[PDB]
Design a protein around this motif. Structure first.
Motif, mmCIF file in Angstrom:
data_model
loop_
_atom_site.group_PDB
_atom_site.id
_atom_site.type_symbol
_atom_site.label_atom_id
_atom_site.label_comp_id
_atom_site.label_asym_id
_atom_site.label_seq_id
_atom_site.Cartn_x
_atom_site.Cartn_y
_atom_site.Cartn_z
ATOM 1 N N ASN A 1 19.334 17.623 -32.797
ATOM 2 C CA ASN A 1 19.620 17.271 -31.382
ATOM 3 C C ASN A 1 18.933 15.900 -31.072
ATOM 4 O O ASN A 1 18.627 15.568 -29.917
ATOM 5 C CB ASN A 1 19.018 18.332 -30.417
ATOM 6 N N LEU A 2 18.726 15.082 -32.106
ATOM 7 C CA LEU A 2 18.318 13.659 -31.959
ATOM 8 C C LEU A 2 19.595 12.754 -31.938
ATOM 9 O O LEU A 2 19.705 11.798 -31.160
ATOM 10 C CB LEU A 2 17.314 13.215 -33.075
ATOM 11 N N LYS A 3 20.543 13.039 -32.832
ATOM 12 C CA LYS A 3 21.884 12.397 -32.856
ATOM 13 C C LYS A 3 22.789 13.009 -31.737
ATOM 14 O O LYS A 3 23.835 12.442 -31.376
ATOM 15 C CB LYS A 3 22.488 12.521 -34.295
ATOM 16 N N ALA A 4 22.439 14.187 -31.222
ATOM 17 C CA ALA A 4 22.898 14.668 -29.893
ATOM 18 C C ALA A 4 22.281 13.732 -28.797
ATOM 19 O O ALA A 4 22.920 13.372 -27.806
ATOM 20 C CB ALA A 4 22.456 16.133 -29.688
ATOM 21 N N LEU A 5 21.006 13.386 -28.982
ATOM 22 C CA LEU A 5 20.222 12.494 -28.084
ATOM 23 C C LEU A 5 20.837 11.053 -28.094
ATOM 24 O O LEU A 5 20.820 10.330 -27.091
ATOM 25 C CB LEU A 5 18.706 12.469 -28.484
#
Length: 14
Positions: free
Chosen positions: A2-6
């Motif tokens: 949920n960083l590349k979601a970020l």
């Protein structure tokens, strides 16, 4: 990740 979601989240700001 949920960083590349970020990065997709900043991404969906336009």
């Amino acid at each position: 990740i949920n960083l590349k979601a970020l990065a997709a989240l900043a991404k969906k700001i336009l």
